[PDB]
Design a protein around this ligand. Structure first.
Ligand SMILES: CCCCNC(=O)[C@H](C)C[C@H](O)[C@@H]1C[C@H](C)CCCCCN(CC)C(=O)c2cc(OCC)cc(c2)C(=O)N1
Length: 379
């Protein structure tokens, strides 16, 4: 019984997906970015030039100070604040209210985004990576412990159609939101949502790297990062192959770094020259894997043309990483992703809001046979 949570996510392209939440008594409404890459629930609690509203602890009668400070650094951005607890609910989520830890953000650096329409972050990953330490219970843990909500959620992130939308199904799977079968990959370790990539193909050709390189030093599923982020060695190989496949057209080197945009006359984007990327994930049974296939419509993110919006302009949404693979929003978009915490696995299926290429199609396909998959995890 999940129809009430369908379409409960909003956002702007490249600025994250948010869900509406309320904090305190009486309830204060805030838009909260959904981040499977972290584990702290934090909200702006002091004025900031990019915040249209913030959490006012003095107006909540159920607020409780924990008299302990907190700091969270991310790959990009950081904030510091004061810890406390309060009553939290999700208007378009389960009909429950829980007491959860809340970090009241008092100072921040490159965290809030001008005009994003969100004021806080909901870290949905595990306690192991919560700050200041893993004794700070994350929100979803509190939700499961205090109510009957099952220990899982799913994310259906939909692309354009600059507005963006989607669904966060709290406590289950909504079968009307995907087609075909769900394919599951083990959660390697409960800290980030860590997975193991066992093979990479571009336009059907194996990159033929040591599969440890794909997971160096980890691979995570992260709704709070836009791009697909790849370790240096993998990024270089992927860009070389993508450049070769599209070499009939000229792009500035700044394009391949995410610095400059590429444009084409409206409706003439040469999709056919950009390859499909297949990520093979470790499966549920011995020597078995499955693949998810990414179309160029996912890793060429449309950007609104600031000048004369007569052209279709895009940014390369694959970037280099020094902290492992990050399967960001552009990978998740077009798939229905099940964070099955109870069974320690992540499921993928083709989304009902999938990308529409005229001759190619995003897919989740299996089974494949893959020997020695555990050797692909980095130690
Ligand atoms: C300390 C405990 C664990 C911390 N976890 C992490 O740091 C994760 C690995 C990352 C988080 O998901 C982390 C979450 C992030 C703050 C949410 C608010 C800002 C979203 C910005 N945005 C729009 C959607 C991006 O696209 C983007 C771009 C980035 O690089 C640009 C060069 C980095 C990150 C995000 C990023 O850092 N996103």
């Amino acid at each position: 019984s999940f129809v009430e949570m369908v379409d409960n996510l909003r956002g702007k392209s490249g600025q994250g997906y948010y869900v509406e939440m309320t904090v305190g008594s009486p309830p204060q409404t805030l838009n909260i970015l959904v981040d499977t890459g972290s584990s702290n629930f934090a909200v702006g609690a002091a004025p900031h030039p990019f915040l249209h509203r913030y959490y006012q602890r003095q107006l909540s009668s159920t607020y409780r100070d924990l008299r302990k400070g907190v700091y969270v650094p991310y790959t990009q951005g950081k904030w510091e604040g004061e810890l406390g607890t309060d009553l939290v609910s999700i208007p378009h989520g389960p009909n429950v209210t829980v007491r959860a830890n809340i970090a009241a953000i008092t100072e921040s650096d490159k965290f809030f985004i001008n005009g994003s329409n969100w004021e806080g972050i909901l870290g949905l990953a595990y306690a192991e990576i919560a700050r200041p330490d893993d004794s700070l219970e994350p929100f979803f843990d509190s939700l499961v412990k205090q109510t009957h909500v099952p220990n899982l959620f799913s994310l259906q992130l939909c692309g354009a159609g600059a507005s963006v939308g989607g669904s966060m199904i709290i406590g289950g799977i909504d079968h009307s939101l995907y087609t075909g079968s769900l394919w599951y990959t083990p959660i390697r370790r409960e800290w980030y949502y860590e997975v193991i990539i066992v093979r990479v193909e571009i336009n059907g050709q194996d990159l033929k790297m040591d599969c440890k390189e794909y997971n160096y030093d980890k691979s995570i599923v992260d709704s709070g990062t836009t791009n697909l982020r790849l370790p240096k060695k993998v990024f270089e190989a992927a860009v070389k192959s993508i450049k070769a496949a599209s070499s009939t057209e000229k792009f500035p080197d700044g394009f391949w770094l995410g610095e400059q945009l590429v444009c084409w006359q409206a409706g003439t984007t040469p999709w056919n020259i950009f390859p499909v990327i297949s990520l093979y994930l470790m499966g549920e049974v011995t020597n078995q894997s499955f693949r998810i296939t990414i179309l160029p419509q996912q890793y060429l993110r449309p950007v609104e043309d600031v000048a004369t919006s007569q052209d279709d302009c895009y940014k390369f949404a694959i970037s280099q990483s020094s902290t492992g693979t990050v399967m960001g929003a552009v990978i998740m978009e077009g798939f229905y992703v099940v964070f099955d915490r109870a069974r320690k696995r992540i499921g993928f299926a083709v989304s009902a809001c999938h990308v529409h290429d005229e001759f190619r199609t995003a897919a989740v396909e299996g089974p494949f046979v893959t020997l020695d998959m555990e050797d692909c995890g980095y130690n």
